[PDB]
């Protein structure tokens, strides 16, 4: 059959509204890992097929099938005979079927957490950016078109939106926010550390006792033409111990089982390793951006002092004390308005807020 | 069954808005290679069928089927007997089933990257073309029809849109853009090099040790009537080594397996080679266009100096110093407006911007 | 099952807007050949059934089925025995299964190319007919109904649309178009040559070594009652060589296989030959029309000089010098407006353009 | 399963707009023959079942099934033994499975051609009736309701629609139409001859060597209770020659096969013969109508001279010379307006055109 | 499975607009007989099952199944032995499977013809009732609600609708209609005779040689408890002659086949006989209504002379000569307006037409 779900993918992939730069790799990460996880445990609707001997009546084949899938499997390159005891034969032991498809779902969830941390944390800060942005937005969606306001366009932002934002600041500033920028940079630290932990989980996945995977080694093998049977690891043909019961208890034998899933798993561990290390390095530089921002803060004002330089007629109020009134809170939320509404609609907003800021400072 | 997906193909094939010339062969390339890849690994919902001997009970047939698919296969033209050892029989060894259907998906993704590079890079440059184009666009969609503005049509562009664009330039020009044209031509260099690398991946695909494919050789064979068995390569009937286990370990035999997929794969490697070399040569000339543009730049102004020659009443301001004010940034974004909105609506825009450009120069 | 796709057929069959006369046989050709191709390789969801002898266990039947389909088949009229060697038996050898269903898809694509050549070429010429036609169109869709403009109807075309068209000509005429008519007639030459090449591909299809098909011979046989077995070619019952492997290598035998597809293929090669030769002869006369047009050009003006003869009040400007101003470019685009908008709405447009043409000549 | 397609049947059955009287039996003919054809080759999703002897293993049953379907079948009434040689047994030979379901599709197409001839031919004539009719139509759809125009209703047709039609005549009359009526009557001759040829194809279908079908003979048999086995023709139980291969080559035997399709085919050849002869005789009288029209032409004016007799106030212009101005072209297009818009809305149009016709004559 | 088609049943069952009294039993008749016919030949997706003896291998069971269905079957009450020869055993011979399900479809079509006769015939008469009724209808749908016209309501019908109808009469009366009432009563004669012929076809169906069916006999048996086996006719268990072929030719035997369809067929021949005789007697009285109408015609005017008796203020014009002007044509179309629009909206129309009728008489 075929399964194509457009809508549910569009829910996370689209619906929640933000343009946040490359923080939307949480949005797409959840989709990739969620779809891969839900696809693998779907078993491509036979995971494993086996050689079980002549006289089994085919209700046992459908048994030794699972009993090989559930109980572990192992591998030996072939011609070593079987070795002996339980050890040298079981030395290389490949069962990651138990982990991978579920631990991916867990991965995806742990990529979704940081957004939740940011929503709950901004609701803790007291000043909601979602409402403000969606407001000044549609203010800019209405009268951008209307020709009645252009020569007035500057004075239009003065009354209606700028009093809304500048009014929200008065309420928030009395409740648990001068700090909301700090809360944001903690959110992005959590983003980075989360990414690296996920990557490390990919590495330590499979089993650390038998190697570990990271891409340029595997591609540095395949592209040398080492396949599997001559590379000594990661096989597609696995022997399977097997146990009946009689008054002689164990009665174990070895039945080799061709193994399909191992053709997918290491075709997508070459991709998904590159893509997770990419999400890691693009998420970790975004963090140092904001520690730099939070630290220097004298060059955090370059964008605002830049917008105030266009400033038709440049009326009166001085520069510094405007930052004295706006400094802790608004200096951030402006860096948010520029990121969503665009650039030019923000400059009008921050040049209007300079005119009406008196009573507060 | 039948699978027909119109919508998801229309998402990439349509939804993101641009007319960029023959840069939309990334758009269609992703569709061709993505659909081919997703179709091949669908196995036309039997990949390979085999001759396995008389006494197997049909749970082994369904085994030696995979065990032949997963483990490699090879070919010998027939009547050579089997030769001997492991080598002369395995000399020509055909397994590209492992690579092709997945490496196509990887291809498609690597065709989608350059668009991403251009979006992220223009967001780095500071001046967003998407917003501007979509703005002056619907400005031209509203009052193109309205009869109240025609004798005023020139003066209409003066106030409303031209102040928007010409205002965006003031903001961008202070932040990391005189260069956005250079960023664009780097994007197109990446486009070309990406295309040629993809083509080279097609060539080196299959296995370089046993020939390599490029079209006029294969068609230069088929159209001479060499099929396969007499051309010595690329078969549809492949022998398959096979291994049981007993106290005598290997016990290998040879069971020839009729092989269906090889009827598709080299029907679409004749097409897809031509089509990739075409995308290559149409993408590589588009690049030299922009290096020429970026270099000479005295003949990059021919279109603007051309629009200013229609110029009703040709009021006052001289020619050169207009380019002195507009030169680095706007000279590009105009070449973008002409490409999307059409030609005649752009000439009005660039003849209006000449009138209101004073304060900035 | 049943597959009925209305929408995707309506996309090519309808969506792209033009009335171009019998150039829409590219539009319908792509549909016929695409649907036939996609239907044939669907195998009418058994291509071939065979007689394979008594003791095969039905996993071999499902093998010799393909091994007969993939490896070639041949035919002998029956009672000749088998002849001998490999030659006299294989003299008539029927395998076109490999070619036909795919080479049809290739056909269809090569019918779609010329439209692409025309779009890209008109975008090279500098003056876009699509925008202009869709503009003066909906200008004629709005105020055709409105009763306020009829006595003014002539003066209505004067201001709004005619300045748009006549303004586009000023821009184009400075960039790489006096020639757009020539580009068009090259497009139609490509149309004709493309058609004849496709037809010749039908002929040389099957195999030229064993006859070739063209309709009045086949119908000139069937309607004489020659079927197949007595006509010596084109059978529905084909013998199939077959090869096992043992220490005696070849072990070939002959197993006759009833062959279904051959009932479809030559029911639609009687139709599709007629229909391609029709598309050829209707496409090739359309070409000589435009070479005649491009050559004489004194009788290319008959339609315009005809429209200017209705001409209420026939004000002032002389005849010839109007053509001197309009000659190279507009004389074409008018022959385009007449073809899409209809006839009477074009006459108003070309009688209005005579009034406002002064400044340009 | 069940297949019900409403929309595609509604496309031809409805969408193209015309009321043309009983020329819409092309419209419905295409539907009947197309649906019958597509239903028969669907095989009622077993065409033929057979008696094949005891020891065949059921992969041969599924062979001799086709090999009987593809290779011909014959019939003998039973108890004649088998006769002998190849002739007396094969005398009556029933295979129309090869022809019927496809030749119906061909029929349907050849019913659709004449409409195409009429569209292309009217586009050759220079004056498009589709646009005009759809125009004066919605002119009559708008202000039929509006109460502001009734006492003015006559004067309403004077300005807006009548100048449109009467203006189109000026353009057409200069290009290849005084004749469009003649083109129409050639179209209807083609209609009639096409119908009779189709009917004759039904007759000569099956095989002329063994009888031929026309209804009152078959019903004149069935309703006498002659079924098949006693009527000597048209059986439901057919013997089937069959050929193996051994060192004795032919080895033919006779295996009688119950035959289902023959229960449908002559249930719908009783219907479809009546219905085609009806379409023939209703289409052939429609033709003599228009040859009469084109010939006498003094009584072709009875409808117009009839409309001019209601004529409130009957102002001035004489009768004959109005026909002198309108005679060749408009006299037809009026007989078209009466057929689509109805009758009363046409009389207003032709009584208005008498008032404004001066300048043209 | 399940098949439920609402829309196609709603097309005939609803879409064509008329209230014609009990002439809509053609509308519902077509649905009943069409659905029954299409359901029966669907075989309730096994028509007949049979006892065929022990040693048949189940590819013969699936043969003797059809060979019993196609070739006839017969019946004997049981214990008579088999009798002898071919006659006494085959005396009662039940095969109506061949006829019934198709002859029902033919029935339905022959119920649909009379509507077609009426549409074509009214289009022959020259005055189209469909347009008029649908016009004065929506005239009554608009201003019935509007409160501005009530005291004016009488004068409202005077200008707008009544001039439309009374104007159509002037055109029609000059072309082939004083007679349209006569055409209508011929249509209803055809309706009645058609109904009785259909009923007689039900009777003579099955086979007249073995009884015939009409309801009160069958129910007069079942409700006496005569079932089948003791009533001597109409069985559910039928013996089936059967023929192999050997050098002894016939080799016929008798294999009794349980027969399911016979449980449906005479459950719905009890219903459908009553329902057809009802449609007959309700359709035949509707006919004598109109012969009475057409004949006396002095009491055909009772409804109009009745409406003119309400007549506010009863202005001037006498009674009889109004009928002299309206007599042949309008006297009918009024009896049509009363049947569709209702009664009270018609009285206003016929009291308005009395006021404005002067010029015509």
Numbering used by the authors:
A (entry chain A), B (entry chain H), C (entry chain G), D (entry chain F), E (entry chain E): 7 to 51, 54 to 369
Give the text the authors published on this PDB structure:
Invertebrates possess a different gap junction protein family, termed innexins, that is essential for eating and developmental functions in Caenorhabditis elegans and for electrical synapses in Drosophila7. We recently revealed that the C. elegans innexin-6 (INX-6) gap junction channel structure is a 16-subunit oligomer, that is, a hexadecamer, with larger dimensions than those of connexins. Here we report the atomic resolution structures of INX-6 determined by cryo-EM in combination with GraDeR.
We first attempted to reconstruct a hemichannel of INX-6 as semi-auto particle picking worked very well. A three-dimensional map was reconstructed from 74,398 particles with C8 symmetry, and the final resolution after refinement was 3.3 Å, which was sufficient for de novo model building. The map of the INX-6 hemichannel includes part of the densities of the extracellular domains of an opposed hemichannel. The Met1 to Gly6 residues at the N-terminal end, Ile52 and Gly53 following TM1, and Glu370 to the C-terminal end were not assigned due to the disorder of the structure. Two helices (CLH1 and CLH2) in CL and four helices (CTH1 to CTH4) in CT are arranged in a helix-turn-helix motif, aligning vertically to form a cytoplasmic core. The INX-6 structure is divided into three parts: the cytoplasmic dome, the transmembrane region including a pore funnel and the extracellular gap region. In the cytoplasmic dome, the CLs and CTs are intercalated one by one through the eight subunits, creating a dome-shaped pore entrance with a 30-Å diameter. The inter-subunit interfaces are reinforced by the polar interactions of Arg168-Asp153, Asp175-Tyr356, Arg178-Thr318, Lys182-Ser317 and Lys183-Asp351, resulting in a roof made of consecutively placed cytoplasmic cores. We found additional densities inserted into the inter-subunit space. These densities could be assigned to lipids carried over during purification, which may serve to stabilize the transmembrane bundles and may also contribute to the conformation of the N-terminal funnel due to the proximity. The N-terminal loops are harnessed by the cytoplasmic dome, and the disordered Ile52 and Gly53 cause the flexibility of TM1 in the pore cavity.
